[PDB]
Design a protein around this ligand. Structure first.
Ligand SMILES: *[C@@H]1O[C@H](CO)[C@@H](O)[C@H](O)[C@H]1NC(C)=O
Ligand SMILES: *[C@@H]1O[C@H](CO)[C@@H](O)[C@H](O)[C@H]1NC(C)=O
Ligand SMILES: *[C@@H]1O[C@H](CO)[C@@H](O)[C@H](O)[C@H]1NC(C)=O
Ligand SMILES: *[C@@H]1O[C@H](CO)[C@@H](O)[C@H](O)[C@H]1NC(C)=O
Ligand SMILES: *[C@@H]1O[C@H](CO)[C@@H](O)[C@H](O)[C@H]1NC(C)=O
Ligand SMILES: *[C@@H]1O[C@H](CO)[C@@H](O)[C@H](O)[C@H]1NC(C)=O
Ligand SMILES: *[C@@H]1O[C@H](CO)[C@@H](O)[C@H](O)[C@H]1NC(C)=O
Ligand SMILES: *[C@@H]1O[C@H](CO)[C@@H](O)[C@H](O)[C@H]1NC(C)=O
Ligand SMILES: *[C@@H]1O[C@H](CO)[C@@H](O)[C@H](O)[C@H]1NC(C)=O
Ligand SMILES: *[C@@H]1O[C@H](CO)[C@@H](O)[C@H](O)[C@H]1NC(C)=O
Ligand SMILES: *[C@@H]1O[C@H](CO)[C@@H](O)[C@H](O)[C@H]1NC(C)=O
Ligand SMILES: *[C@@H]1O[C@H](CO)[C@@H](O)[C@H](O)[C@H]1NC(C)=O
Lengths: 438, 438, 438
């Protein structure tokens, strides 16, 4: 690759798995209905004031979301035609989500004609014919719990306990719902809300939601774990207590001439001390351009790095030069923890710090020795066919690089400290020196 | 406001929603009892050794908490009168919590006179008359589960399976409880423990707790999501296995002459490349003082920023000058990701980077062009009444700033890189240069 | 200790609790079987296609894990001998985990001889005789739910609702399972994944797992909360849908001549302003060596700091000199928030910023005054026996340090700003100054 792997390997940074870059795109939209209140028609004998109190509590949660949705519904018309003077302040994502909301209102209007049928649902999952060809699924929360726990036990227990059990179930449902659908949800007009978060209105059963929707594909689990499947609330009903959610199932596009290269950090010896290299562990290479990538927001598999959006971030010229060969530009940090890697395997070849760990060859019985002028030792089956590292015995391959690897040395970079307080102290010391300098 | 909004918008910092500052204060205290063990009197036929093992396991969890509480209970008198010699080491928060614990012990002593009544509770929520006027609520864990699942199925299933079901429910209850009430809780003498965390002793039903306690308030959900409602364990019983928790319910005070200003980041063009501005997105302004605010610990709504404590943090003079007009002091960062904003709306006026995106006007049909010397374009209805951005059509309004906005240019700040490894490399390179100079 | 506690306290770093350092070591291994599919033989009348669909969905989840495990199984032989040529790329942790997997395969082969007995399990927890002396426990998911909820209600409700209830339970089980056992688990050959994460295959009942395994020890909860108890998947069956997990039980080893010292930050007055000190709050001292420690990954109790591995990190020379007495090297930060501590107690002695908070003595009735040249006031019973801080009254001990503490002053360190944008701006400004100089 573009990176100088041979020079990188001598300061740790052993070449790891090469993964292709995938980003979701081209979503397909399906509409579902989540009914936030169960049907207690069959336990209504002693529901008491529990349902009235629950409806009063749920109206206060659903009302701000509805108001924020009609804020964009009222100011979007047909020339998608948005009035910026009434909207006032919005971001590009908010305006795009408003456009998507306007597009979804066409189907929401057809769905809303089945309000009585939605009210009459008495099962957790039901199918309704929105049109002659389109079917809408209604997902009722706690309906399964009521049907399988409260209906069979109405006449067995004093149903004053059924009222308390129903009250506790509704409040526990609200307890899990409040983190996602509460005041934290200040921007319901957005398509970045994952289906897992939306499923909290259905008890967290996004598996049931997606399986019922019939979304079958090879990349289903990858899309789920990359947070690429998203839902958007397009309508809120305060009389029947249900929401219409549009689920956007996209497909993964492999970015052409793009891959993510992983570097395995290995401690190396320098100046009679143990060091580690402070460089990005994951490097994104698009065409011939080298840049950082925030892989913590992505899904990392053994074959590809999967993200819901482009997470590329800039890279300094010094770090780019370090990755392209200038090993003197690579920052390094002292090693004081005993639990730090000291060897790694790449292409059947072992890169080990044989000063911190004991390297012994099984073929000859003689220990492999590392001098004080060598940072790492490259052990292939030319040096000797089988090396022993304590309880580990490994058969080695042949190195595809230079034959004088262990004879040719390099230069090491400047030591650094990556702790927050240490960074602040370094900045202070450098400023107290720079004031004298200038 | 005090900020220079025009110059900030010229570098892509578009003015956002202005929110007032709210901090909780003046809490009212209520005492509740949480019984960590259910009443199995009606399933006692084949509970077996399960209850003995559960009590043995729960004693080891509750003993350190009781010891830590008695550490402060034993060293507080009337001469709130605290003996610092015996306490030894404590913080201001710990001492204030000890004072609150001493205040709560007066009511805890009255509550403890109903120990037999607490032991005899056989419902999830019961009401006990602590005095002639005060009422205390007892919340029993898994009591509803036992009453609605195990009691009705005593004679139907082989009750050796009931013993296994009871054992699994208790162990699952301990599994969720251990993260909050385990060795992590090293400081039970503190009033910073949220009611949501305390509710883990009741299966996570803080909604049930707060609804039973009453607590009718408009700011109820805001207080819940700002982590302002807190509870404190004031007494632990190792014989009846219950705890007394004092719930603190504060009110939200709007800080006078204080508001939080949000800045919407928009990419801008400079030197034939795309850049973003590295400035705080949320700026707290109290009176005429500008400072940072850690909004990640607060609750953000469309109307206010709500925090459980003051989260103001200092700001550098350079950043303050950047926010007050000195745009040459504003750090900027290169843009390499495709998924960063290019336009935003503020006051009916669109600030767009018409080089990265296509700006076309519907009224005239001609594309809106941005020269290479302009960072951003301000598009108001004085220019043209309706702009088109791909699939988005927006009606704009008059701008309230300078009429020569698109003719007047500004200066741009120094480029920076905000990655961790990039920061370390920059610090090392700058130290190398400084050492070479001196 | 090695730290200069007096000078540290004079800049608001009051000595806290001294905790010893503990790291897990010498694990003992026990093998368990988790059956990912329940036995629905007693509700098979109307399970329908639900079980077939669930098996199809679960095969896709479990197949990559089995493939990754067989990747190491196929390339490990008795000759522990590993073929590095076929492995290609691996880290030291991966190779050690492969060695552990090879060691566990010997017992996995004996366990797999009871495949029919594992298939026939119809209880949540059962005991099987793997050999004449060894015992293996099988944990079946949702088996208790089926036995106690679906079997008793087979003929009471329309069993078409039983099929929907079974479908929802299986899908909810998969929803919780997907985060741990989904595409995120790209490296099943590793012994660093905790038993709590493993328990997600059993509904999160790690308490049941460990109690059934019979692991009884004093440090049980400490090992649990330090993330020291870990499990490794050693075998995956795609025909019976179960996994074999080897649980590692380490012991907590107290590091000799090592302890973690905590410093309590207290605001202090300087130049008519309030400041805080930016130094590490937790300092790890091993022998005579001072270094940082990442205590966020560890478990902190009142007696010791417990970690699953060594988390020591380097410390700069400037920060070390600050901790050892050079108070002019200690970075300090301005105080703008009202909710920052102003006093603390250590050894019965109060260190308070009496400029910011009102200090009054009860014994004499006269207020304690702090001059503008003093950062903090040390108040012991030599000064006066009982101090009052608002609603707090504390009896004080005697200071064991210098008697001229409040008369001797020190020098203060350079001011710093710890915000991210502030750090970037400071770096840019210092680079601009350095470039102007050179
Ligand atoms: C939107 O318009 C409806 C009437 O169509 C009105 O009831 C509602 O209050 C409006 N909401 C907003 C936010 O303007
Ligand atoms: C409610 O009860 C009636 C009569 O007992 C029954 O026909 C109906 O199916 C029940 N509803 C549900 C959802 O089971
Ligand atoms: C050494 O490893 C290489 C792998 O590159 C392999 O082809 C070769 O057979 C091995 N043995 C020898 C003696 O080269
Ligand atoms: C700067 O470098 C010198 C020598 O290279 C070193 O002694 C000093 O500690 C370094 N300081 C910082 C803040 O990096
Ligand atoms: C507190 O005092 C009680 C007796 O009133 C005693 O049993 C207990 O052990 C003491 N605890 C501590 C921490 O001193
Ligand atoms: C326990 O059983 C008795 C007799 O069947 C009954 O009177 C009592 O109400 C039951 N307890 C509860 C809490 O239901
Ligand atoms: C531009 O919008 C303002 C309101 O913001 C309006 O008063 C003015 O007449 C508009 N000019 C047009 C439509 O040309
Ligand atoms: C400092 O600024 C110069 C020019 O402004 C630039 O070339 C260099 O990369 C910068 N270095 C750092 C560490 O900011
Ligand atoms: C399944 O049903 C049979 C016949 O009713 C019964 O003997 C057996 O115990 C049941 N299985 C379980 C696990 O209860
Ligand atoms: C491992 O070997 C088995 C046969 O023993 C084979 O079925 C399987 O595909 C192999 N897996 C890998 C990753 O080589
Ligand atoms: C002051 O505190 C010390 C420390 O415990 C104590 O020994 C002494 O009795 C106290 N009183 C006096 C008058 O020294
Ligand atoms: C450097 O120090 C000077 C005076 O000591 C100060 O004015 C300036 O703000 C500091 N710059 C930093 C900390 O970036």
């Amino acid at each position: 690759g573009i990176l100088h792997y041979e020079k990188l390997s001598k300061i740790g940074l052993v070449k790891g798995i090469t993964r292709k870059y995938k980003i979701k795109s081209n979503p397909l939209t399906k509409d579902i209905v989540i009914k936030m209140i169960p049907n207690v028609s069959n336990v209504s004998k002693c529901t008491g004031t529990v349902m009235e109190n629950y409806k009063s509590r749920l109206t206060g949660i659903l009302s701000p979301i509805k108001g924020a949705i009609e804020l964009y519904n009222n100011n979007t018309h047909d020339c998608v035609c948005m009035a910026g003077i009434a909207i006032g302040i919005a971001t590009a994502a908010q305006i795009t989500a408003g456009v998507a909301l306007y597009e979804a209102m066409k189907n929401a209007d057809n769905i809303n004609k089945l309000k009585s049928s939605i009210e009459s649902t008495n099962e957790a999952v039901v199918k309704l014919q929105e049109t002659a060809e389109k079917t809408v699924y209604v997902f009722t929360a706690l309906q399964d719990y009521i049907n399988t726990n409260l209906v069979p036990t109405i006449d067995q227990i004093p149903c004053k306990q059924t009222e308390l059990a129903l009250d506790l179930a509704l409040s526990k449902y609200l307890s899990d719902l409040l983190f996602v659908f509460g005041p934290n949800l200040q921007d319901p007009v957005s398509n970045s809300m994952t289906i897992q978060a939306i499923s909290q209105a259905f008890g967290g059963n996004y598996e049931t939601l997606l399986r019922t929707l019939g979304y079958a594909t090879e990349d289903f689990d990858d899309l789920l774990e990359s947070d690429s499947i998203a839902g958007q609330i397009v309508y809120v009903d305060l009389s029947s207590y249900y929401i219409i959610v549009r689920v956007y199932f996209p497909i993964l596009t492999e970015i052409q001439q793009a891959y993510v290269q992983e570097l395995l950090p290995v401690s190396f010896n320098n100046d009679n001390s143990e060091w580690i290299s402070i460089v990005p562990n994951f490097v994104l290479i698009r065409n011939t351009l080298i840049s950082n990538i925030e892989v913590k927001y992505c899904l990392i598999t053994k074959k590809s790095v999967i993200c819901n959006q482009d997470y590329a971030t800039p890279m300094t010229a010094s770090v780019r030069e370090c990755l392209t060969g200038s090993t003197d530009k690579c920052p390094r940090e002292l090693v004081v923890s005993s639990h730090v890697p000291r060897f790694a395997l790449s292409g059947g070849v072992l890169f080990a710090n044989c000063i911190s760990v004991t390297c012994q060859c099984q073929t000859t019985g003689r220990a492999i020795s590392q001098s004080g002028e060598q940072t790492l030792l490259m052990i292939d089956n030319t040096t000797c066919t089988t090396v022993v590292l304590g309880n580990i015995i490994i058969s080695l391959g042949k190195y595809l690089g230079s034959i004088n690897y262990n004879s040719e040395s390099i230069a090491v970079g400047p030591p650094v400290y990556t702790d927050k307080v240490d960074i602040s102290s370094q900045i202070s010391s450098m400023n107290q020196s720079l004031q004298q300098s200038k």
